[PDB]
Write a protein that binds this ligand. Structure first.
Ligand SMILES: Nc1ncnc2c1ncn2[C@@H]1O[C@H](COP(=O)(O)OP(=O)(O)OP(=O)(O)O)[C@@H](O)[C@H]1O
Length: 268
């Protein structure tokens, strides 16, 4: 599974970034991931191999309230079309995440509103999990605006949480530290050249993050493996820095940002 997941994520990263498709024969599965910092649309064959994907940077969830619901539909619409020109065909339906911390099924309604018959809603925990293909473990989706702890065992979301921290505080904590406009700082944070030198300054937030999880795991089985996914974990060494403050080493996959999105698509 580790090898599989890694290869699929590297693929999906290219399908997205170099805007090309994987010419697998239909039927396809589509997934839309609604989010604090980005919207992602993902297509796969019936075995979950990536076929297509697109991503827009977009704050249409602020605190879980779809605060730009129309903006959402515009984005999903523009994504659906990009993927559609790039792919042979057109798409009819998708699964979605109703992100936790949120009357937020306007989710489905963005998907329906972009012209996709809703296949189902998913919990990000459920998705995240399936993508890792991990039955028993702990998942720490560290999104842009909230993190979202969760506990699966036997093959069930046996406990779940979430707490208003993520990539943005980092970028902000950097913005503040460096004394730089927030966009200016986000452009930096994201550049891979600078992780080395942006690290020390942004470490404090990671400490905080880890100890918050430590706490929530201070009631749950320690046998449990620990998987840190989500775009915030794109910081090189994030794995290490976090693996310390928490207490146990963590697994962060090759393209952290993509894990949930790929997972949702697995439902459609
Ligand atoms: N190369 C990178 N280096 C550092 N951080 C990155 C990089 N690329 C993306 N990120 C960070 O990941 C965050 C967005 O992550 P993610 O896509 O998981 O969250 P979301 O879409 O807002 O919510 P969800 O977790 O449900 O997807 C942003 O803060 C972004 O800065």
């Amino acid at each position: 599974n580790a090898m599989e997941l890694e290869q699929k994520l590297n693929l999906l990263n290219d399908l997205i970034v170099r805007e090309i498709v994987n010419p697998l024969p239909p039927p396809y599965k589509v997934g839309v991931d609604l989010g604090t910092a980005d919207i992602v649309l993902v297509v796969t064959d019936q075995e979950g191999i990536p076929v297509a994907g697109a991503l827009k940077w977009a704050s249409v969830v602020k605190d879980g309230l779809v605060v730009d619901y129309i903006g959402a539909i515009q984005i999903v619409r523009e994504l659906k079309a990009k993927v559609e020109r790039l792919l042979g065909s057109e798409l009819f339906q998708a699964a979605t995440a109703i992100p936790p911390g949120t009357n937020a099924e306007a989710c489905g309604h963005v998907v329906a509103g972009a012209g996709l018959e809703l296949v189902t809603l998913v919990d990000e925990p459920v998705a995240a999990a399936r993508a890792l293909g991990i039955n028993d473990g702990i998942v720490v989706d560290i999104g842009g605006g909230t993190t979202g702890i969760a506990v699966i065992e036997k093959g069930k979301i046996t406990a779940t949480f979430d707490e208003p921290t993520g990539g943005t505080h980092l970028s902000l904590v950097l913005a503040g530290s460096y004394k730089i406009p927030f966009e200016e700082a986000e452009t930096i944070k994201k550049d891979f050249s600078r992780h080395r030198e942006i690290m020390r300054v942004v470490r404090p937030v990671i400490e905080k993050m880890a100890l918050i999880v430590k706490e929530v795991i201070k009631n749950y089985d320690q046998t449990l493996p620990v998987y840190v996914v989500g775009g915030t974990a794109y910081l090189t060494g994030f794995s290490e820095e976090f693996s310390r403050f928490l207490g146990k080493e963590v697994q962060v996959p090759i393209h952290p940002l993509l894990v949930t999105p790929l997972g949702i698509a697995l439902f459609g």
